[PDB]
Design a protein around this motif. Structure first.
Motif, PDB file in Angstrom:
ATOM      1  N   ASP A  94       4.840  -3.399   5.422  1.00 46.63           N
ATOM      2  CA  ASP A  94       4.685  -3.174   3.932  1.00 46.63           C
ATOM      3  C   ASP A  94       5.699  -3.694   3.043  1.00 46.63           C
ATOM      4  O   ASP A  94       6.041  -3.368   2.016  1.00 46.63           O
TER       5      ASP A  94
ATOM      6  N   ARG B  10       6.939  -2.150  -4.722  1.00 47.13           N
ATOM      7  CA  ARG B  10       5.502  -2.162  -4.318  1.00 47.13           C
ATOM      8  C   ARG B  10       4.695  -1.089  -4.848  1.00 47.13           C
ATOM      9  O   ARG B  10       3.374  -1.405  -4.988  1.00 47.13           O
ATOM     10  N   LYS B  14       1.193  -1.451  -7.011  1.00 48.71           N
ATOM     11  CA  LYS B  14      -0.211  -0.612  -6.692  1.00 48.71           C
ATOM     12  C   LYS B  14      -0.828  -0.897  -5.573  1.00 48.71           C
ATOM     13  O   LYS B  14      -2.180  -1.060  -5.639  1.00 48.71           O
ATOM     14  N   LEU B  15      -0.103  -1.227  -4.539  1.00 52.81           N
ATOM     15  CA  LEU B  15      -0.710  -1.522  -3.109  1.00 52.81           C
ATOM     16  C   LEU B  15      -0.825  -0.251  -2.291  1.00 52.81           C
ATOM     17  O   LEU B  15       0.084   0.447  -1.694  1.00 52.81           O
ATOM     18  N   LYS B  16      -2.126   0.188  -2.164  1.00 50.24           N
ATOM     19  CA  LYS B  16      -2.352   1.410  -1.453  1.00 50.24           C
ATOM     20  C   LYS B  16      -2.831   1.223   0.065  1.00 50.24           C
ATOM     21  O   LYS B  16      -2.326   1.599   0.890  1.00 50.24           O
ATOM     22  N   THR B  17      -3.909   0.606   0.061  1.00 46.77           N
ATOM     23  CA  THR B  17      -4.675   0.570   1.074  1.00 46.77           C
ATOM     24  C   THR B  17      -4.103  -0.557   2.093  1.00 46.77           C
ATOM     25  O   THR B  17      -3.411  -1.572   1.708  1.00 46.77           O
ATOM     26  N   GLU B  18      -4.698  -0.694   3.336  1.00 48.03           N
ATOM     27  CA  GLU B  18      -4.350  -1.896   4.377  1.00 48.03           C
ATOM     28  C   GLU B  18      -4.654  -2.996   3.495  1.00 48.03           C
ATOM     29  O   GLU B  18      -3.904  -4.299   3.665  1.00 48.03           O
ATOM     30  N   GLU B  19      -6.033  -3.183   3.005  1.00 47.03           N
ATOM     31  CA  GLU B  19      -6.507  -4.534   2.674  1.00 47.03           C
ATOM     32  C   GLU B  19      -5.677  -4.989   1.372  1.00 47.03           C
ATOM     33  O   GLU B  19      -5.615  -6.215   0.968  1.00 47.03           O
ATOM     34  N   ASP B  20      -4.946  -3.996   0.477  1.00 47.09           N
ATOM     35  CA  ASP B  20      -4.180  -4.692  -0.680  1.00 47.09           C
ATOM     36  C   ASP B  20      -3.100  -5.453   0.036  1.00 47.09           C
ATOM     37  O   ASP B  20      -2.516  -6.414  -0.550  1.00 47.09           O
ATOM     38  N   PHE B  21      -2.504  -5.106   1.120  1.00 50.07           N
ATOM     39  CA  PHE B  21      -1.412  -5.738   1.687  1.00 50.07           C
ATOM     40  C   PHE B  21      -1.889  -7.212   2.361  1.00 50.07           C
ATOM     41  O   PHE B  21      -1.407  -7.974   2.503  1.00 50.07           O
ATOM     42  N   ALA B  23      -4.251  -8.771   1.211  1.00 45.61           N
ATOM     43  CA  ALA B  23      -4.438  -9.610   0.159  1.00 45.61           C
ATOM     44  C   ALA B  23      -3.291 -10.384  -0.576  1.00 45.61           C
ATOM     45  O   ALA B  23      -3.245 -11.465  -0.698  1.00 45.61           O
ATOM     46  N   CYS B  24      -2.317  -9.341  -0.552  1.00 52.34           N
ATOM     47  CA  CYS B  24      -1.057  -9.911  -1.263  1.00 52.34           C
ATOM     48  C   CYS B  24      -0.451 -11.000  -0.135  1.00 52.34           C
ATOM     49  O   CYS B  24       0.086 -12.022  -0.481  1.00 52.34           O
TER      50      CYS B  24
END
Ligand SMILES: Cc1ncc(COP(=O)(O)O)c(C=O)c1O
Ligand SMILES: Cc1ncc(COP(=O)(O)O)c(C=O)c1O
Lengths: 421, 423
Positions: A94, B10, B14-21, B23-24
């Protein structure tokens, strides 16, 4: 609690500086030559084992632009180190993603490759440039050339040594990586001629030569160089490892020319001198030649160094250290010039942008080390490059009071050496 | 606890789910790596993804995290030195680097320590030292020095490392290449002996078990006999213990299995309990001393902070007796798998390892090796094969007995679940 290095160090009864020097001569590979034993740093100041104070005018050759032990940087280190330090890039985390997003926006690039050292950022860029030249320029196999400048310095790998013109960097380290063409620095004509070879992949260049002697080029050099490179579809790789990150009075030294490098190298102060992290940045259609499996690193992009780097970079922004380096650097050069040119006839030049400054002395008419020792005596720590080039590279957070005091102490040391001639 | 800078940045994104990360990562990070998981915390043998799902880390940085993630003592040593002094360059002295080198010099038995940052730098530094020693002491012609290496070696990603690789993706389109290398088969005394006939050879550069090459364990006596052969030709033995060293294989160095004391020793990875990149090159005085002032260096090599961590990281190895722990659990792990998986599962080609450096080779034509990675993950095991078909099992050596038992069970269950599913 005492940590292991503390309890071990106490056990050896190291009392004087000499005791430490002897420890080093016995157990540390002898690949460096000064006499001081630093114990503690904070801001522009360091302290030796006896509690004597100095201004640090090397600052990691611009790795400590934010000062020693910046509280914000140390706190971000410590808070991340409690959660997570290493995943490998074989797993997500993260931090790495957001860090790269942060850097990519601050410097205006599509893609960020994170490595650990400056040299690795260099090899990484040479690799990307070769592969892009084979796969996009379609230049014949193994024929890729990279242009660079006499007296360059980008590291100590065998490939780095292979592209150096400095005897002691390359001597007895071959046989050498081929594929380099050396030209004079700050020479527009030589670049153009060398750009006639259609197998050239990249020109690799520093905006100011650092270890080469703080060689500030003539106005428009980098701008013109960029134009000639584009003309022949040749990548401009700009090494801002020493010159970047506000050191010269702008975010990047290339901003002085409004050059956006095709590939950008950052390092050193990218971590505030806390952990090694470097970066290579570029547009997608160049950087994307590095496919899965074709490049990597264990520690590259680890979450600990990322967290540090973000905080380090935020310190540059929030404390306005670019503006600061410009104001103080002009004041520094003006002061030294008024007080030393003419009066000190063995000073060949006083040069720099921002707080990347140097005094070139004539080594036939003085011994450089006398200047260095008199600097030390007056509370100023510094190391020259190439024997005769005195360098003045303080942390950019040096206060106005501190910077005035140091400038005085510097002027005094040069005059005292002249007097003593 | 208070929100860290990095966390508020972060949260801002607005990175919450696994897929937001994911994609980033795809947008902004150079796409030079291939796994679906977002880790945010490590303690010991465990990690947790952002959702609070718990796993066993069975890569441990490819043996960078032998002391576990976020070991209290190592962190405390980082933080206490971090507040005092992190960097001076080796152009000024300090109160940490000399003592730290003495510590290592004494623990491993060598005269001189060169501290670098990465594994690859240590490798390069060794090639530089060997070459320069061959020219200045052996007095071979200029630019004629050779170094012998094994097919499928991995020592890093510099252009010179690429130049000496036999792995297509590592070298392809990164030339032209640094000359001076002679490749021979791993685990082949005949081929080593033959290649040592060339008097231009400066060194033999070898791993006691091939790491990225597929946990390839040589035949008994290989390293012993190799050292004899090199010594008879006045050729340096450089042993890369970056991955195999520091207790991973049941002993302080893997070379100890053969009572080999390398002429040059490389360490890294767990040298820092994976907190910071620090590597080391160790050798006798009359070899290491060819590096005279200004002929080599590094901005961050031998920085106070990293020295502080390494000395703590090395102490953890002794105090918690992790060589013994690796030996005991390792043997048990190989025991468990060979019993329960040979015979029942035909597409296991081999189970191999020493200490807690183990591997399960699968027939990639009879099965998809990715099914195995995903089933392990499903059962709480994070692993990453090398070369498609070599399943690696490299946990931290601080893995407890219960954690290891549970983990071994989850691992067997995954292999059997894939064979069941084949049927
Ligand atoms: C311009 C430049 N590039 C690269 C490097 C190498 O950095 P490092 O010493 O971190 O490998 C240095 C030092 C430098 O001054
Ligand atoms: C045996 C071996 N040597 C060297 C390296 C290079 O280490 P780094 O990724 O720290 O450069 C690795 C990885 C490795 O497994």
């Amino acid at each position: 609690r005492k940590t292991n290095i503390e309890a071990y160090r106490d056990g050896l009864k190291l009392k004087t500086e000499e005791d430490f020097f002897a420890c080093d001569r016995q157990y540390v590979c002898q690949n460096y030559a000064v006499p001081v034993v630093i114990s503690k740093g904070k801001g522009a100041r360091v302290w030796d084992i006896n509690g004597n104070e100095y201004y640090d005018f090397l600052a990691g050759v611009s790795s400590l632009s934010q000062g020693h032990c910046h509280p914000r940087v140390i706190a971000a280190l410590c808070r991340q180190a409690e959660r997570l330090t290493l995943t490998l890039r074989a797993f997500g985390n993260d931090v790495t993603g957001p860090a790269c997003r942060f850097m990519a926006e601050m410097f205006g690039y599509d893609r960020v490759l994170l490595m650990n050292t400056g040299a690795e950022a260099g090899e990484s860029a040479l690799k990307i440039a070769r592969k892009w030249a084979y796969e996009v320029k379609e230049i014949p196999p193994d024929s890729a050339k990279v242009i660079l400048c006499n007296n360059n310095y980008w590291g100590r790998t065998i490939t780095a040594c292979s592209s150096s013109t400095t005897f002691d960097c390359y001597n007895n380290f071959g046989p050498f990586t081929p594929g380099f063409e050396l030209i004079d620095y700050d020479d527009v004509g030589a670049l153009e001629e060398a750009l006639k070879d259609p197998n050239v992949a990249a020109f690799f260049v520093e905006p100011i030569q650092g270890e080469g002697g703080v060689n500030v080029p003539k106005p428009g050099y980098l701008k013109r160089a960029h134009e000639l490179c584009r003309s022949k579809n040749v990548l401009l790789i700009v090494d801002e490892i020493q010159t970047g990150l506000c050191r010269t009075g702008r975010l990047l030294a290339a901003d002085h020319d409004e050059v956006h490098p095709d590939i950008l190298l950052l390092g050193k102060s990218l971590s505030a001198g806390v952990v090694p992290i470097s970066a290579v940045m570029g547009r997608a259609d160049v950087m994307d030649v590095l496919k899965p499996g074709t490049h990597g690193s264990t520690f590259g992009g680890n979450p600990l160094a990322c967290a540090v780097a973000v905080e380090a970079l935020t310190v540059l922004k929030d404390e306005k250290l670019a503006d600061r380096a410009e104001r103080l650097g002009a004041q520094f050069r003006d002061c030294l010039r008024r007080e030393l040119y003419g009066k000190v006839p063995w000073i060949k030049e006083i040069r720099g942008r921002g707080l990347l400054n140097a005094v070139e002395v004539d080594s036939d008419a003085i011994d450089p080390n006398d200047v260095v020792m008199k600097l030390k005596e007056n509370g100023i720590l510094s190391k020259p490059t190439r024997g005769r080039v005195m360098r003045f590279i303080p942390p950019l957070v040096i206060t106005d009071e501190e910077h005035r005091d140091a400038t005085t102490r510097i002027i005094k040391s040069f005059l005292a050496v002249e007097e003593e001639r």
